[PDB]
Amino acid sequence: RGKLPPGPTPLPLQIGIKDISKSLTNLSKVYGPVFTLYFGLKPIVVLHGYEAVKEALIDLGEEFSGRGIFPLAERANRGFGIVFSNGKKWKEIRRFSLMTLRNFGMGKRSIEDRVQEEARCLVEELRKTKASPCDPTFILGCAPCNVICSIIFHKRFDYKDQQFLNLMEKLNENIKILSSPWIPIIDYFPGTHNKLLKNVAFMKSYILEKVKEHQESMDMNNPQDFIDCFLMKMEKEKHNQPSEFTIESLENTAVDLFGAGTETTSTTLRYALLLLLKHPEVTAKVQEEIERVIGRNRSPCMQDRSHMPYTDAVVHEVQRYIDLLPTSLPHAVTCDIKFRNYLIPKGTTILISLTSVLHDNKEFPNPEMFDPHHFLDEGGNFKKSKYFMPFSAGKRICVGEALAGMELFLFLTSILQNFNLKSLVDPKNLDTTPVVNGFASVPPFYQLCFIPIHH
Ligand code: HEM
Ligand SMILES: N#Cc1cc(S(=O)(=O)Nc2nccs2)ccc1Oc1ccc(Cl)cc1-c1cn[nH]c1
Numbered sequence: 330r331g332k333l334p335p336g337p338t339p340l341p342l343q344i345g346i347k348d349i350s351k352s353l354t355n356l357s358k359v360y361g362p363v364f365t366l367y368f369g370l371k372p373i374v375v376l377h378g379y380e381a382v383k384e385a386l387i388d389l390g391e392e393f394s395g396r397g398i399f400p401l402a403e404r405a406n407r408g409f410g411i412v413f414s415n416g417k418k419w420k421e422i423r424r425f426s427l428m429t430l431r432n433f434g435m436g437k438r439s440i441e442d443r444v445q446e447e448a449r450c451l452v453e454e455l456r457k458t459k460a461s462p463c464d465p466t467f468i469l470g471c472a473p474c475n476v477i478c479s480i481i482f483h484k485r486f487d488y489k490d491q492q493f494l495n496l497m498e499k500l501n502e503n504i505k506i507l508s509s510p511w512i513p514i515i516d517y518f519p520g521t522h523n524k525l526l527k528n529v530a531f532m533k534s535y536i537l538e539k540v541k542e543h544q545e546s547m548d549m550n551n552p553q554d555f556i557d558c559f560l561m562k563m564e565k566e567k568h569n570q571p572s573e574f575t576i577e578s579l580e581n582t583a584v585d586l587f588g589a590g591t592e593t594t595s596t597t598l599r600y601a602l603l604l605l606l607k608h609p610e611v612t613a614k615v616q617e618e619i620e621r622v623i624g625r626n627r628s629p630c631m632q633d634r635s636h637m638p639y640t641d642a643v644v645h646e647v648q649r650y651i652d653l654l655p656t657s658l659p660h661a662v663t664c665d666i667k668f669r670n671y672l673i674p675k676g677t678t679i680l681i682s683l684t685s686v687l688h689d690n691k692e693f694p695n696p697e698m699f700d701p702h703h704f705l706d707e708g709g710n711f712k713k714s715k716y717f718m719p720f721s722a723g724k725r726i727c728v729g730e731a732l733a734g735m736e737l738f739l740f741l742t743s744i745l746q747n748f749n750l751k752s753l754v755d756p757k758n759l760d761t762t763p764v765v766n767g768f769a770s771v772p773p774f775y776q777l778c779f780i781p782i783h784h
Contacts, residue, residue, distance in 0.1 A: 331665065331674035333372055336365035343510040345765035350655035350684045353377060357685070363669065366680075368513075373659075373678040374671075377685045379692070379716055385668065386681065386723030392666040394419075394724035397659025397678045400507075400515065401522065405529050410581035411728060412589060412658070421573045422582055427728055429558050430480075436553040443479045444735045445628055447472050448743040454488055455748060455779045462753055462776040465599055470497065473594035473736055474587075481583050482539045483554040496535065496587075499528040504592050509767045516767075529584060536583040540576065555583065590729050592769075593653060594736050600772040601647045601741055604699055606752040607759050611701060615640050616745050625782060629742040631735060638711035642704035644737050648687075648719040650699045651763075651770050655684045657721040683718055692716040699761075744779075751778035 337356065356364060357377035366373045376382050385393045396415050407413045411423050432439055451472045458468075471488050474497055479485045486493035506525055509517040543556045552558045559579045566572035605612040622636050623629050634641055660679035665672065673679075688696035692714060693703045706712040720727035727733070752759060753776050763770045 330672075331677075332672045333365040333374060333677070334360070334363045334671045336360055336367065336375075339367040339369050340513070341366065342512070343516070343765050344512060345510045346655050346768055347684075347763065347770060348765070349511070350652075350682060353656075353680075353682050354685060357682075363671070371678075373680050374673060375680045375682065377682045379686050379689060382681055382683075382686055382718070382722060383715075385679070386660075386721070386725075389666060389668070390724045392663055393660055393679060395661030395663045395676070395679075396725070397661045397680075399659050403522075403526055403529070405526050405533075407529070407581060407584070409575075409578045410583075410585035412585040414581075415661075418573045418578070422578060423728060425559070425562060425574070426582060426586070429555055430728060430732060434552050434558045434561065435480075435555070436483075436551070436557075438553070440480070440732060441631055441735060441739075443476055443485075444732075444739050445630070446485070447476050447479075448739045449628060450475070450485070451740055452743055452747050455744065456781065458779050460751075460778050460780040462778060464774070464776055465602055469598045469602075470501075470591070470595045472598075472740055474500070474591045476732070476736065477587050477590040479554075481536070481555045481586060482543075483557075496532065497591075499531050500588065500591055503528050503588065507768050508771065510765055511767060532584050532587065533580050536580050536587075537576075540579065555586070586729075589727075590732065593729075594733050596769060596771055597648060597651065597653060597733070597737060598740060600651045600653075600770075601644075601737070602744070602750065602777065603761060603772045603775055604647060604650070605745075605750055606775070606777060607756050607761055608699060609750075609756060611643060612745065612750055615643055616749075619742055619746050623742065623746065625746060629739055629746065631738070633742070634738055638705070638709070639701065640738075640742065641711050642701040644734075644741065645704040645717060646699065646701045647737075649693065649703060649717065650687075651772075652684050652687050653719060653770055654721075654768070655682070655770065657681050657683050658725070660725065681721065683721065686716050686718045689716050747782055748779045749782060751780055753777065 353375055354377065356375070362376070362378045362381040364375050366375060376385055396413060396419070408415065409418070411419065411426055414422065429435055430440065451468065454468050454471070475485045503525060506517060506521050509515055540556055543560060547560065549561060552561055556579070559574065563572070563574045566574045618637050618640050623633055660681060662673045662675060662677050662679060664675050690696055693716065704712055704714065720730045759775070760773050762773060764773050
């Protein structure tokens, strides 16, 4: 009925996501680009290398647009948003969320304005540290979180506001839980399931109390944020009930946008500053480019990027090198599909190696080294690549691709516009090797001085 590709015998100290990814690369040398892992009776089809990922995710987009069971299916039911939803529900909410994130039916304030406002608020907070040793984990975490708050409810927060400090606490708790290594099964069961369920319930309740406030000023001609645009769609999809657009779907989608829209961006920014300390020649050329194209006078904008090939290469190189999410999120085939010499049955888990694409030894000669020239042709021009898949590929490609692109470019140019980067430790012996983590390539702990600008 369904002939899955060949793989090893079933059943395969701490095993982090990078350890998982390295083992997957080892098995691909033995079995080829496409192989099955069997976990007793439960199969997982692994896709290694660009050709296999491209053939499945892009060439057979609809067939590979399903979402896998990733950890444990929480009864709080997170399958009503984007990240964990499937079928018609996913198709509609994803479409709706994409267009809202592309400034459609969200008022006249652009996404860029919000990111630029936060870029200014992020610079002011870094000035407060008065050029003394700082762990940027907190400050870099507040900026992407505040961008999402602004998009969902049209309200940003002060870095000392308790309402903000509570949201971030629940988020950071959920990240710590999610980031637990493995040992066949995940490490984290001495009551961590209930805390996850509790934290998600708190975030949902908080979004729900904001949803009421918006229902007071309900107006068809004045949407100003995500809650308004969704309520307006809910009102437009009544009498055509039932709809995928409900109060609980709005709630889950909002939690999804909060979770996904904070940590990935926050971790990338933290890892970008670490690589800039370790590579002082690279930082100098970036600061040189900002001078000649933007200066110290005005705030950066997305229009500057096309005029800054070297800085664009650094942004892309940070994301290619760090390989933030080595296996993306699990996929599933939506129906029975013929993939090369195999027949994969409906609902079969599909695991994609993003490491195998981002660290391709032919597309990126010496992929293990940090080098902006991986995104530069032989003449020094920006060289875009089909292998740039940090946001994954196909129908499930990160809905926050454009936003995270804006945040990285705008927040990093603004930091390098108003500050020099001073490392406490000599960059020659400064550690960059990522810490063992269950879902992401997270950077090791470091400290730095944010010194106001000088030539
Ligand atoms: C550095 C920043 C980010 C990276 C490297 C990243 C990476 C990804 C990846 C690898 C996936 C999995 C896609 C797949 O299933 O194959 C994903 C999904 C998603 N990302 Fe991101 N993400 C980032 C920032 C964001 C932001 C800023 C937001 C929100 C506005 C966001 C919202 C999502 C959502 C909703 C999904 C679910 C897409 C779907 O399931 O249809 N992400 N992301
Ligand atoms: N991080 C994160 C994250 C965490 C959750 S949760 O299950 O902890 N519930 C939450 N609700 C609200 C906050 S936390 C849900 C979606 C999230 O997103 C990703 C999760 C895993 C992986 Cl592997 C990737 C993402 C992701 C990031 N950006 N884009 C995708």
